[PDB]
Copies of this chain bind each other. A is one copy, B any other.
């Protein structure tokens, strides 16, 4: 379970930050090294929008046209020239990792700048959103663009969602999407003990086998979640990642709690 020999077994780099929100106990490993967060940022944008729009007001529609459309939008693809509710945008973003949905949410929030401002209010000076989908995924170890550290990103998830200011309804709406999500089943969920419940949002950048998973993990018997951010990448641009790496990382970290 040493994270060091997980990096060896897999020849990858692991960035972890786990915070038991009950005890405040943290597990860090390369927790201050930057990683491209890819689709895991969708959790952040969704949370931020849910801060400014009451659950009852998620039924508000927003028009989607061709310009809004970006690659890998299994849901939003068909909304060209149609309206979609803020509620359905968030579901598309969280369940399907829909790229057009996420951009739209960011737009609704006020843009990247607004996202940045918010991050800064949350005391997050590390999380660096610079581009929208899908370009936020063109990770370069040379660039800080669209990257965060496991610690900065974890602290933000905590402050925004776990110990945030979301209403009961919106927090539930969001955590349930991440809970019900079957997309990151091979990641944190795969490595945690049978009885734990995992509310995650996976992600994978285009380069360096940047494969991430962030989650609200709930040990059987605990209602308070452990915020778990696992970012992983490899040395080469075209490197393919191994999800079992995240699964094994979550297994190990969870044993700390």
Contact = CB atoms under 8 A, between A and B. Distances in A.
Contacts of A185: 75, 88
Nearest to A82: B186
B243 A183 contact: no
A148 to B, nearest CB: 23
A96 B74 contact: yes
As for how many copies of this chain the complex holds, the number is: 2
A180 interface: yes
Contacts of A79: 186
A183 B88 contact: no
A92 interface: yes
A180 B176 CA distance: 11
B78 A182 contact: no
A91 interface: yes
A129 to B, nearest CB: 24
Contacts of A91: 182
Contact of A74 (B78, B82, B183): B183
B180 A180 contact: yes
9 contacts: A74-B96, A75-B182, A78-B243, A82-B243, A88-B182, A91-B182, A92-B182, A96-B182, A180-B180
